[PDB]
């Protein structure tokens, strides 16, 4: 099916506690394959995936140098942002970015991404055209002007349509036994009385990959959106994910409720009931 490669970078100032920390982590879908942390004892591009270990020392070194230069660039950016927002040198601030590409089953580009947030708010994003920017406020308009003068978007486009797609295709091939394998959820429903009048049904999905999944409860065929407690999908620590959905049911009416599970690993959508 479709696949994504994305880097998630965080730079955070800490005045009085050294220069800002920069961490960058790369993922293919929900699999981390690289981390760089400027606070690591010897900062290096560090493999988080066995299929990356397969790339030679020149790949490592090339990316290591890009991450080290990116650490300095993000510190530049944090100093400029503090000034664009008239902020004092005393406070901690955070600049985040996400960039990368999505491809379909044939490996062709679906869309590219390059965007930034400052202090948890969107700041600037490359548009889906890969040619223009959307700036959130007058500070990001200054960055947009600088990047338009310097023809930054063209460099980004070239990365996203070229380098990014080419490497994603290569990673998918070298990692095909894991990256291209969807593991279906193991599912079950549990029942927990609350009182004589009601009980909880909890519908569980365990051991699945990738993390995207839909779990819903229906009463007599009607979606119980408003009345369902859905927990955030969570990692198990062995590459797979877990999730549950619970609804509070009147005693004796359990059989009127059905849990529906959709996942790319399943041959067909599951409908489950209590026992």
């Amino acid at each position: 099916g479709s696949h994504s490669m994305r880097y998630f970078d965080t730079a955070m100032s800490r005045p009085g506690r050294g220069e800002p920390r920069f961490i960058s982590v790369g993922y293919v879908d929900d699999t981390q394959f690289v981390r760089f942390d400027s606070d690591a004892a010897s900062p290096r591009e560090e493999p988080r995936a066995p299929w990356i270990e397969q790339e030679g020392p020149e790949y490592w070194d090339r990316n290591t140098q890009i991450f080290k230069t990116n650490t300095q660039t993000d510190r530049c950016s944090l100093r400029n942002l503090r000034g664009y927002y008239n902020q004092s040198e005393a406070g901690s601030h955070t600049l985040q970015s996400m960039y990368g590409c999505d491809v379909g089953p044939d490996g062709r580009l679906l869309r590219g991404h390059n965007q930034y947030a400052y202090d948890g708010k969107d700041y600037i994003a490359l548009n889906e055209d890969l040619r223009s920017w959307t700036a959130a406020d007058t500070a990001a308009q200054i960055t947009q002007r600088k990047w338009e003068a310097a023809r930054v978007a063209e460099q980004d486009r070239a990365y996203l349509e070229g380098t990014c797609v080419e490497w994603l295709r290569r990673y998918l091939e070298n990692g095909k036994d894991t990256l291209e394998r969807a593991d279906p959820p193991k599912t079950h429903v549990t029942h927990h009385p609350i009182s004589d009048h009601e009980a909880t049904l909890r519908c569980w999905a365990l051991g699945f990959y990738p993390a995207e999944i839909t779990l819903t409860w229906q009463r007599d065929g009607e979606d119980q959106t408003q009345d369902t407690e859905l927990v955030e999908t969570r990692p198990a620590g062995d590459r797979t994910f877990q999730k549950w959905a619970a609804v509070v049911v009147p005693s004796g009416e359990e059989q009127r409720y059905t849990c529906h599970v959709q996942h790319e690993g399943l041959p067909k959508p599951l409908t489950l009931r209590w026992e």
Partner: peptide, 9 residues
């Protein structure tokens, strides 16, 4: 490299 060169904001 899979990493992208970044630009100062």
């Amino acid at each position: 490299a899979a990493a992208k060169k970044k630009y100062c904001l």
